[PDB]
Automatic annotation (TrEMBL), chain A:
Known catalytic reactions: RNA(n) + a ribonucleoside 5'-triphosphate = RNA(n+1) + diphosphate
Gene behind this protein: rpoA
Origin superkingdom: Bacteria
Protein name: DNA-directed RNA polymerase subunit alpha
Primary role: DNA-dependent RNA polymerase catalyzes the transcription of DNA into RNA using the four ribonucleoside triphosphates as substrates.
E.C. number: 2.7.7.6
Example of a GO cellular component annotation carried by this entry: cytoplasm
Organism from which the protein derives: Escherichia coli
Family statement drawn from the similarity comment of this UniProt entry: Belongs to the RNA polymerase alpha chain family.
Enzyme class: transferase
GO molecular function: DNA binding; DNA-directed RNA polymerase activity; protein dimerization activity
From TrEMBL, chain B:
Family the entry assigns: Belongs to the RNA polymerase beta chain family.
Gene name, Swiss-Prot/TrEMBL: rpoB
Entire-sequence positions represented here: 1045 to 1093 of 1342
Assembly: The RNAP catalytic core consists of 2 alpha, 1 beta, 1 beta' and 1 omega subunit. When a sigma factor is associated with the core the holoenzyme is formed, which can initiate transcription.
Record's function text: DNA-dependent RNA polymerase catalyzes the transcription of DNA into RNA using the four ribonucleoside triphosphates as substrates.
The protein's name in its UniProt record: DNA-directed RNA polymerase subunit beta
Highest taxon of source: Bacteria
Length: 225, 49
């Protein structure tokens, strides 16, 4: 009759990039059910901090090329799209990257304002070939959800980049048996995930529980005709 | 007759949408039905869709 409730019995940070977690106890059938549900939601709609706008002083339009930088402006923008950031209090913020001289250019050179936190300083944006050629650029990043391209939301120097509001890429789940526990058929659910590192596993799974519940609140809210 | 001619170059970044056409290396013609969520797609045991 009863249905024993699971608990987040384990969180483990296997790598600095990602983690795995465990739910226990679960009973027959609920395993794959909650597995697909959680995987679908944890892949579908999460918070995000994808870069939104990029300004560069020497750039009129995107498809030009700056002197002293080997790669195209578009390639630089794609590298920026490969960036990941963490912010706590503010919905939006402006980041400032200023640097000249020969050598690589990674996120480590960006201004390190408090809530703004780089998760991948080693992420290279570009390389510079000139001792005196300063890339000096402002980066508006705000929160969001899902995927917002430029054509949707749509200054001449302000160049627009599509949004990629997603901190995770890979998710999988496995059911298995638990200890005897004086009761067999108890199901342990192990959830494995891969993230850039911008989201804690507990935060993500708790938000998944909350969102799926309020969706079920509609099922609770079923009224009249 | 002409006194001056002016040309202008417009860039458009077209990504993808339903109805576009693509194929491989076997004559395997194919238009694209519907861009669809990662979550509707099938995935292996390790989860990669």
């Amino acid at each position: 009759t009863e249905f024993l409730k699971p608990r987040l019995v384990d969180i483990e940070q296997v790598s600095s990039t990602h983690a795995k977690v465990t739910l226990e106890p679960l009973e027959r059938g609920f395993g794959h059910t909650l597995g697909n549900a959680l995987r679908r939601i944890l892949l579908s709609s999460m918070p995000g901090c994808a870069v939104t706008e990029v300004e560069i002083d020497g750039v009129l339009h995107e498809y030009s090329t700056k002197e002293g930088v080997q790669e195209d402006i578009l390639e630089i923008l794609l590298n920026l799209k490969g960036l990941a950031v963490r912010v706590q209090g503010k919905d939006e913020v402006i980041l400032t990257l200023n640097k000249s001289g020969i050598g690589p250019v990674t996120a480590a050179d960006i201004t390190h304002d408090g809530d703004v936190e780089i998760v991948k300083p080693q992420h290279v944006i570009c390389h510079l070939t000139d001792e005196n050629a300063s890339i000096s650029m402002r980066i508006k990043v705000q929160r969001g959800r899902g995927y917002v391209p430029a054509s949707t939301r749509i200054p001449i120097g302000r160049l627009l980049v599509d949004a990629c509001y997603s901190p995770v890429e890979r998710i999988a789940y496995n059911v298995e048996a638990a200890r005897v526990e004086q009761r067999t058929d108890l199901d342990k659910l192990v959830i494995e995930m891969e993230t850039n590192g911008t989201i804690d596993p507990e935060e993500a799974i708790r938000r998944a529980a909350t969102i799926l519940a309020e969706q079920l609140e509609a099922f609770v809210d079923l009224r009249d005709v | 007759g002409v006194l001056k001619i002016v040309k202008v170059y417009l860039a458009v970044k077209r990504r993808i949408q339903p109805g576009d056409k693509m194929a491989g290396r076997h004559g395997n013609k194919g238009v694209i039905s519907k861009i669809n969520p990662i979550e509707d797609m099938p995935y292996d045991e390790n989860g990669t869709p």
